[PDB]
């Protein structure tokens, strides 16, 4: 399928134990895709002071379109020192490994695989 329905646990930044996916733009996008597929990927909603508490490079989910089955359509954009790899809509948040942290919510999304 070109798209995959996912239910992302929404984590508080201060609960996150592993604060990024790795050390290169291409690695974090690869790791983010592997965690999404294995159901081990969390989502931190971006506000004032959130990104400084996370590790670069960042992986964002951004709105790719304006919502099948209640799932917002999104795609991955990585960022490293102010430069984004990919082009998309509004940020829904930043992806991180999930290692069993208790979420505050779930975000239903349709990821463009």
Curated annotation (Swiss-Prot):
CoV Nsp1 globular domain ranges (all copies): 2-113
Region span, Disordered: 1-113
Q: Where in the cell is it found?
A: Host cytoplasm
**What is this protein's function per UniProt?**
Inhibits host translation by associating with the open head conformation of the 40S subunit. The C-terminus binds to and obstructs ribosomal mRNA entry tunnel. Thereby inhibits antiviral response triggered by innate immunity or interferons. The nsp1-40S ribosome complex further induces an endonucleolytic cleavage near the 5'UTR of host mRNAs, targeting them for degradation. This inhibits the integrated stress response (ISR) in the infected cell by preventing EIF2S1/eIF2-alpha phosphorylation upstream of stress granule formation and depletes host G3BP1.
Put simply, this protein is called Host translation inhibitor nsp1
Q: What organism does the UniProt record list as the source? A: Severe acute respiratory syndrome coronavirus 2 (2019-nCoV)
């Amino acid at each position: 399928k070109t798209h995959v329905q996912l239910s992302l646990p929404v984590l508080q930044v201060r609960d996150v134990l592993v604060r990024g996916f790795g050390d290169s733009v291409e690695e974090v996008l690869s790791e983010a895709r592997q965690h999404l597929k294995d159901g081990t990927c969390g989502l931190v909603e971006v506000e004032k002071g959130v990104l400084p508490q996370l590790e670069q490079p960042y992986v964002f989910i951004k709105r790719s379109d304006a919502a099948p089955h209640g799932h917002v359509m999104v795609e991955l954009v990585a960022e490293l020192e102010g430069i984004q790899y990919g082009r998309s809509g509004e940020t829904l948040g930043v992806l991180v490994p999930h290692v069993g942290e208790i979420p505050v919510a779930y975000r239903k999304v349709l990821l463009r695989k």
